[PDB]
Amino acid sequence: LPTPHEIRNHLDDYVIGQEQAKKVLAVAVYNHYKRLRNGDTSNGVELGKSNILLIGPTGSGKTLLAETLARLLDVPFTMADATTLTEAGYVGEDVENIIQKLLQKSDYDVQKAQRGIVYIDQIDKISRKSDNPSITRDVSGEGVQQALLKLIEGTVAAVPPQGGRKHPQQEFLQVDTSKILFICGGAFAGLDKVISHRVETGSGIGFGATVKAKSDKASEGELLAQVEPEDLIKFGLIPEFIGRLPVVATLNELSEEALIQILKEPKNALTKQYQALFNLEGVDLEFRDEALDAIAKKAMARKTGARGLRSIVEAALLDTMYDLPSMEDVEKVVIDESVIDGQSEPLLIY
Amino acid sequence: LVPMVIEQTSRGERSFDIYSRLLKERVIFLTGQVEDHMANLIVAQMLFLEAENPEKDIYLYINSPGGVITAGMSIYDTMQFIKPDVSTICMGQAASMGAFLLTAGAKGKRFCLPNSRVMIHQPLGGYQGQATDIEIHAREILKVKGRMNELMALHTGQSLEQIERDTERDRFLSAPEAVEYGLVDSILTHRN
Amino acid sequence: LVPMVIEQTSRGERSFDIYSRLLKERVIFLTGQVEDHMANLIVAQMLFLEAENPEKDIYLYINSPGGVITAGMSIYDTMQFIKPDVSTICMGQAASMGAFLLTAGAKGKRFCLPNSRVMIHQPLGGYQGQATDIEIHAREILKVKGRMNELMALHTGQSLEQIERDTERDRFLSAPEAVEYGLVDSILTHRN
Amino acid sequence: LVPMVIEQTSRGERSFDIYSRLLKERVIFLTGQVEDHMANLIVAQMLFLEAENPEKDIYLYINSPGGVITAGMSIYDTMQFIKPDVSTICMGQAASMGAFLLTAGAKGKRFCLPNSRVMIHQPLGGYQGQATDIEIHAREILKVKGRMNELMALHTGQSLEQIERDTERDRFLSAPEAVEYGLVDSILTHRN
Numbered sequence: 001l002p003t004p005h006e007i008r009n010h011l012d013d014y015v016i017g018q019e020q021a022k023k024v025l026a027v028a029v030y031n032h033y034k035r036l037r038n039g040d041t042s043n044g045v046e047l048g049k050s051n052i053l054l055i056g057p058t059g060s061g062k063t064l065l066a067e068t069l070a071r072l073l074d075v076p077f078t079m080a081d082a083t084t085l086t087e088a089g090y091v092g093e094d095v096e097n098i099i100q101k102l103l104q105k106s107d108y109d110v111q112k113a114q115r116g117i118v119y120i121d122q123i124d125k126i127s128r129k130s131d132n133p134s135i136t137r138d139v140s141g142e143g144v145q146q147a148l149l150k151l152i153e154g155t156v157a158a159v160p161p162q163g164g165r166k167h168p169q170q171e172f173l174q175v176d177t178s179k180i181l182f183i184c185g186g187a188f189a190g191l192d193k194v195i196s197h198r199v200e201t202g203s204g205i206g207f208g209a210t211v212k213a214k215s216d217k218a219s220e221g222e223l224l225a226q227v228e229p230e231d232l233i234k235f236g237l238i239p240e241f242i243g244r245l246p247v248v249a250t251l252n253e254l255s256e257e258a259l260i261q262i263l264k265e266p267k268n269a270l271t272k273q274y275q276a277l278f279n280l281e282g283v284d285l286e287f288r289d290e291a292l293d294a295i296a297k298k299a300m301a302r303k304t305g306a307r308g309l310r311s312i313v314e315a316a317l318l319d320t321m322y323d324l325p326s327m328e329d330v331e332k333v334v335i336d337e338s339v340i341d342g343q344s345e346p347l348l349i350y
Numbered sequence: 351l352v353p354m355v356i357e358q359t360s361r362g363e364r365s366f367d368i369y370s371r372l373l374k375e376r377v378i379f380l381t382g383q384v385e386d387h388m389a390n391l392i393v394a395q396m397l398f399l400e401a402e403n404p405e406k407d408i409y410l411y412i413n414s415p416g417g418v419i420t421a422g423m424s425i426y427d428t429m430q431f432i433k434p435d436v437s438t439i440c441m442g443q444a445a446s447m448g449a450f451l452l453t454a455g456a457k458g459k460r461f462c463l464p465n466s467r468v469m470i471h472q473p474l475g476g477y478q479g480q481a482t483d484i485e486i487h488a489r490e491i492l493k494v495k496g497r498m499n500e501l502m503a504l505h506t507g508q509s510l511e512q513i514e515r516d517t518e519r520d521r522f523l524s525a526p527e528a529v530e531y532g533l534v535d536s537i538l539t540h541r542n
Numbered sequence: 543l544v545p546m547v548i549e550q551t552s553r554g555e556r557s558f559d560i561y562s563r564l565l566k567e568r569v570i571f572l573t574g575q576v577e578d579h580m581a582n583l584i585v586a587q588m589l590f591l592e593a594e595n596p597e598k599d600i601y602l603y604i605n606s607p608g609g610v611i612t613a614g615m616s617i618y619d620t621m622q623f624i625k626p627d628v629s630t631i632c633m634g635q636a637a638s639m640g641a642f643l644l645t646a647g648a649k650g651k652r653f654c655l656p657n658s659r660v661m662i663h664q665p666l667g668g669y670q671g672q673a674t675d676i677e678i679h680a681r682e683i684l685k686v687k688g689r690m691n692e693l694m695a696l697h698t699g700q701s702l703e704q705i706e707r708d709t710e711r712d713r714f715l716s717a718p719e720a721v722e723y724g725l726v727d728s729i730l731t732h733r734n
Numbered sequence: 735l736v737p738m739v740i741e742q743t744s745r746g747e748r749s750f751d752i753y754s755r756l757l758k759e760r761v762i763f764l765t766g767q768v769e770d771h772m773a774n775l776i777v778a779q780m781l782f783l784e785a786e787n788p789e790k791d792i793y794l795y796i797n798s799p800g801g802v803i804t805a806g807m808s809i810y811d812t813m814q815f816i817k818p819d820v821s822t823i824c825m826g827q828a829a830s831m832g833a834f835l836l837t838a839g840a841k842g843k844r845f846c847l848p849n850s851r852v853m854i855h856q857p858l859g860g861y862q863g864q865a866t867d868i869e870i871h872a873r874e875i876l877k878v879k880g881r882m883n884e885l886m887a888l889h890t891g892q893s894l895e896q897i898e899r900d901t902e903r904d905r906f907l908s909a910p911e912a913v914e915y916g917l918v919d920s921i922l923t924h925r926n
């Protein structure tokens with residue numbers, strides 16, 4: 001039922017500056033609903049499932065894409081992690097843990113588990129570490145991928161429903177995994193150097209070679225578009241694991257100017273939250289372009305600038321918020337760039 | 351002593367020497383006098399890069415007071431034979447043979463530093479023995495001088511007569527004059 | 543002999559030599575006489591740091607009695623070409639060429655120890671042969687002397703005529719005098 | 735040859751050379767003649783220890799017949815610049831420059847072995863050339879002698895006049911007499 005154009009229009013409200021990734025995901029999810037909705041008991045049967053592989057820089061909005069999609073989407077969503085997993089009954093974590101976590105979102109309904117979607121972060125962290133004379137059995141490395149192969153393709157694993165009140169139940173449910181979708185994505189480290197050597201030019205250390213002058217001036221994203229499965233082999237991934245994820249996403253980067261868009265265009269932008277918080281009091285909140293620019297530089301300086309907007313904004317308005325109820329006959333509040341630095345106090349209009 | 355550095359990769363950490371790290375980026379260093387051992391080592395490096403990638407540009411930094419001619423001519427034919435464009439840069443100094451390898455680089459990919467200096471002269475030699483043998487070694491070194499001037503004109507664009515007059519004695523050429531002489535293409539003053 | 547140290551990292555323990563450990567922190571050592579081999583090694587170190595980070599300041603400690611001029615001028619052009627600010631420090635002594643690379647550092651990031659000593663003189667050379675050849679090498683070394691005085695004045699701010707008079711003979715300059723002469727910015731007596 | 739030892743750690747066993755093992759415990763060795771290479775290596779060791787811990791005392795064992803003055807003065811300024819107290823010990827012998835680095839240690843943390851011996855004299859030099867150049871080098875070495883005597887009085891507490899008379903010629907000082915002269919603090923006869 002959901003049309004890719006309609007679902008993309010809704011996602012644009014929550015995502016800024018990422019278009020290629022939206023088209024890729026829209027087709028898959030639409031096919032997934034169609035695959036599960038349509039019985040498919042026709043001449044052609046057992047339709048294949050195109051799993052999605054998301055690639056992008058840290059703090060690019062990957063978690064929001066899955067969660068914001070899950071908010072409007074009816075089916076349940078979960079956020080698992082790959083680093084915790086440890087193969088062959090090791091101390092860290094059994095693979096089966098992912099499935100039991102899904103059931104809580106599905107209220108222990110098997111039919112709802114096939115409908116829902118799963119997301120995994122930090123997938124690059126389990127890249128095949130290749131040190132020959134150390135172990136030769138990398139639990140954190142290659143070994144984990146081998147266990148996920150059968151999981152993604154499809155199999156049934158016993159899962160105690162609800163954990164059981166006590167030994168009395170001692171039963172397990174059979175949960176299919178073929179129809180379940182899997183979204184495995186993580187910010188790969190050092191991948192840009194791998195593709196530069198083989199694709200564009202004789203770059204590097206030397207004089208004529210292009211230096212990394214555009215560390216922050218330009219976005220590396222355009223390079224990721226030319227990524228292919230063969231390049232991931234050098235990274236450590238097994239070809240069998242890559243075959244399980246045919247689709248690929250780019251998610252080039254977030255821009256300083258995009259941060260300004262994130263504060264004004266989105267429905268859940270911080271500006272709209274505080275604006276409504278003060279509107280009820282008969283006060284108006286005004287943000288100036290100079291103030292936004294200062295916020296961008298401060299967020300860029302710290303790690304994961306996208307996740308640090310709350311701290312910068314909250315500290316700036318913490319003092320003003322304390323005195324706003326006490327103050328009377330104040331209808332507007334003005335914030336300046338100097339205030340963001342902390343050397344100035346916001347202007348008050350009566 | 352040579353310092354050791356660490357290059358970070360997805361598989362793990364790898365330790366490289368300063369010279370080997372630059373070799374990974376298609377960069378070769380030509381230091382000191384040109385001899386049979388030093389020259390044969392550079393040839394092996396170029397061939398290794400050819401097999402790894404025949405389409406990527408190579409960068410050759412030259413800082414040497416020159417040396418044997420026969421050792422240097424092996425490198426010149428190699429640079430022209432292989433498909434990749436061998437970019438040349440002059441750092442510090444480039445003598446007679448260092449200048450010949452400098453201009454032999456790919457056209458349009460030759461640079462010289464703002465304070466570098468190039469010097470060119472005629473081949474040096476000598477022999478001791480019978481008069482019949484002195485005539486033989488004299489005719490051979492004379493052919494080389496003629497051959498070295500013909501190739502110098504080809505890359506520099508000057509006439510063979512001009513190279514003959516300028517190479518009769520030692521001739522130092524500053525960095526700006528080298529550009530005007532067709533020996534190089536530009537100067538890398540600052541990074542852009 | 544070179545001692546080995548252990549650097550603790552999240553991945554694990556790694557063994558490094560004392561010189562390589564400091565190289566990781568953008569620190570290069572210039573020790574002994576300046577020659578073609580020692581100079582060509584420092585150039586690769588500077589370039590290696592440029593790729594890692596072109597926005598972090600580099601520190602260059604110099605303790606050397608000087609040496610060849612052509613080997614030193616390759617380092618001078620490198621410091622000015624690359625974007626990072628090459629901080630220079632004088633430890634023990636800084637001769638003619640060591641002083642030229644010292645003052646060539648970034649303005650405001652040049653230091654000298656309280657008891658260090660700098661010495662400056664004119665270029666040295668010589669030749670043996672026909673009178674025609676002596677005139678050629680004499681004109682060449684004269685240009686260098688003029689060129690070395692022009693660049694020294696550019697960073698020190700002094701006049702070309704003053705540098706010419708002070709470089710006619712050996713001239714020793716104490717650490718305080720270097721500040722008054724514009725050669726350095728301050729002295730790192732104690733840590734603050 | 736250098737023996738290899740094994741240091742047991744929680745992570746695992748690690749093999750270390752005898753000099754690197756002691757370096758982990760903030761111990762540096764000053765052996766042989768003082769030159770530009772040996773001095774430049776010790777300076778890097780002090781800096782490495784400063785970053786690891788700036789509040790732990792450093793121990794410097796000196797056994798050397800002295801050497802170049804300029805190489806040693808770089809170490810003296812370094813010891814005074816850094817915050818940690820550089821403990822100095824004289825083993826075997828401490829010549830003119832070795833004695834200056836010995837007494838330059840932190841007050842109250844300077845020791846000398848019961849059978850060690852210290853020798854002090856004036857700076858040595860020489861020059862060959864025109865009379866105008868000899869006068870320049872003579873004034874320079876005279877400043878060093880005056881500067882070296884001023885600092886000796888500062889740390890030893892004696893007067894400048896006394897240091898001038900005692901340093902006119904070679905003067906040997908036994909371990910007990912060094913205490914009476916203010917050069918050291920005590921003697922480490924036995925462990926308590």
Ligand SMILES: Nc1ncnc2c1ncn2[C@@H]1O[C@H](COP(=O)(O)OP(=O)(O)OP(O)(O)=S)[C@@H](O)[C@H]1O
Binds near residue numbers: 015058059061064121
């Ligand atoms: N398109 C966007 N619109 C609005 N805010 C965004 C957007 N993209 C990222 N953000 C901000 O970035 C924060 C982190 O988003 P995430 O999806 O967690 O990024 P991330 O790259 O997935 O981080 P990882 O991979 O989980 S470490 C969010 O809480 C938002 O504040």
